[PDB]
Amino acid sequence: MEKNFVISDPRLPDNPIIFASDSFLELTEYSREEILGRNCRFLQGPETDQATVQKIRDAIRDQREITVQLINYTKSGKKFWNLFHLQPMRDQKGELQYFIGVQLDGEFIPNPLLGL
Numbered sequence: 113m114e115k116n117f118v119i120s121d122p123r124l125p126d127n128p129i130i131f132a133s134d135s136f137l138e139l140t141e142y143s144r145e146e147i148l149g150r151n152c153r154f155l156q157g158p159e160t161d162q163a164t165v166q167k168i169r170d171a172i173r174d175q176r177e178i179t180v181q182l183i184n185y186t187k188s189g190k191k192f193w194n195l196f197h198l199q200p201m202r203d204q205k206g207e208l209q210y211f212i213g214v215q216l217d218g219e220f221i222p223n224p225l226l227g228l
């Protein structure tokens with residue numbers, strides 16, 4: 113199955129990417145060496161809704177799952193809608209270990225309705 117996802121380590125500064133799937137690199141047009149060690153906010157750009165970004169920030173803080181749809185950008189500046197799902201991962205002791213983020217490319221929710 114095709115699967116776009118990245119894994120970050122929130123126990124390192126600014127929650128860097130430590131793994132990115134091959135399909136994620138295909139979707140975003142970045143190479144792995146460009147991405148490792150970066151926060152995934154590099155996919156955002158001028159048309160990204162800051163109110164939606166704030167929902168993600170809150171979800172990270174509370175370590176809760178969240179799904180939002182937002183505009184992201186490829187390396188070449190192509191805009192794509194991203195139905196983005198964030199999932200905390202905990203170790204056996206219940207301590208946060210990783211976050212996984214999964215991206216689905218498509219305008220699933222029409223933008224006029226998303227605007228509401």
Ligand SMILES: Cc1cc2nc3c(=O)[nH]c(=O)nc-3n(C[C@H](O)[C@H](O)[C@H](O)COP(=O)(O)O)c2cc1C
Pocket residue numbers: 118119120127151152153155156165166168169172182184194196198211212213214215
């Ligand atoms: C594992 C993971 C994957 C993420 N994937 C995306 C993504 O695909 N697109 C996106 O716009 N933001 C993504 N983010 C969110 C940004 O990295 C960042 O958390 C968000 O912009 C809010 O934090 P900031 O206000 O410090 O930028 C992801 C975050 C994590 C932890």
